[PDB]
Write a protein that binds this ligand. Structure first.
Ligand SMILES: O=S(=O)(O)c1cccc2cccc(Nc3ccccc3)c12
Ligand SMILES: O=S(=O)(O)c1cccc2cccc(Nc3ccccc3)c12
Length: 302
């Protein structure tokens, strides 16, 4: 049954992502509240890159309890309206709301666990997120959290425009990307999630840089400047410069004080320099940190 924009009552703008703005809408025909992501695509060179649509089709294929539910796709001349399930809020706004007490360990541990489940599902389906941050992770009242606002590959890039203020996307960006390697892996999402793990425990972003080189130095100041020992092939990296300052690695009892050995074990495995040593989503799930994992309800509010 065909859906149209005239079917949907807009109620309010719930935020803006990388590729448009997202609206809280009310399907007048069901009374059901949904989220609409508007997408102005550019039939520029006619679109249809054939790399772009191939990846997007892998995205629509994904059905998992920890990936936001795409209900319908509405085409109108030069526009695309993505109909999503409506969800309560994002992880960033949640972390801000309770930055005064922190998120209880069981809820941190639960969110982390579900995110690894969602990523593990993506990674076995040849999908990467590429832009994992608290902003674009969505929670509900059940106690669930879901991946949203996926990134797109190959530099540019599917035929859409963005309209975005300067990134804070750098904060969660894996080092191999910051040193310019051409082919990266699923390990880039593990890094980002690892950073988010730390932020949930400390109530603050691990590596808040204002530029690519500033981002690398913040990583270096904390985990130490990597060499060929810790990371084979690092010195030959396209954007590696031997002029890099040498920093000694800090210890985790100071970087993430409330973490016990199991959390630090896992965090260090997620924050490994070398992508070929960095723990996978599927393997992170089997980690003794998640031995007593539960599904707590979030203490929610506006
Ligand atoms: O494949 S669709 O399901 O349409 C789709 C769904 C969700 C997001 C999309 C983003 C760009 C292009 C699409 N395809 C497209 C193809 C031809 C014309 C216009 C858009 C997207
Ligand atoms: O919105 S997301 O939350 O990433 C998303 C979530 C779930 C399924 C999706 C399917 C196709 C495109 C998406 N986003 C997309 C990315 C780039 C351009 C156009 C659409 C999907």
């Amino acid at each position: 049954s065909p859906e149209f924009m005239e079917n949907f009552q807009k109620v309010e703008k719930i935020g803006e992502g990388t590729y448009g703005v997202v609206y809280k809408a009310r399907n007048k025909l069901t009374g059901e509240v949904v989220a609409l992501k508007k997408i102005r695509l550019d039939t520029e060179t006619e679109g249809v890159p054939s790399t772009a649509i191939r990846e997007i089709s892998l995205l629509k294929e994904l059905n998992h309890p920890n990936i936001v539910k795409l209900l319908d796709v509405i085409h109108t001349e030069n526009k695309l309206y993505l109909v999503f399930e409506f969800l309560h809020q994002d992880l960033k706004k949640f972390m801000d709301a309770s930055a005064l007490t922190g998120i209880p360990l069981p809820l941190i541990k639960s969110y982390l666990f579900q995110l690894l489940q969602g990523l593990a599902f993506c990674h076995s389906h040849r999908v990467l997120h590429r832009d994992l941050k608290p902003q674009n992770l969505l929670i509900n009242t059940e106690g669930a959290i879901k991946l949203a606002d996926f990134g797109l590959a190959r530099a540019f890039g599917v035929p859409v425009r963005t309209y975005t203020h300067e990134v804070v996307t750098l904060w969660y960006r894996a080092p191999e990307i910051l040193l310019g390697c051409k082919y990266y892996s699923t390990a880039v999402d593990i890094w980002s999630l690892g950073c988010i793990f730390a932020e949930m425990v400390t109530r603050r972003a691990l590596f808040p840089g204002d530029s690519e080189i500033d981002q690398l130095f913040r990583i270096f100041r904390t985990l130490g400047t990597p060499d060929e020992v810790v990371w084979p092939g690092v010195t030959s990296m396209p954007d590696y410069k031997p002029s890099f300052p040498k920093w000694a690695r800090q210890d985790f009892s100071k970087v993430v004080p409330p973490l016990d050995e199991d959390g630090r074990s896992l965090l260090s495995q997620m924050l490994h320099y070398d992508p070929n040593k960095r723990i996978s989503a599927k393997a992170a799930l089997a980690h003794p940190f998640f031995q007593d994992v539960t599904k707590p309800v979030p203490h929610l509010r506006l």
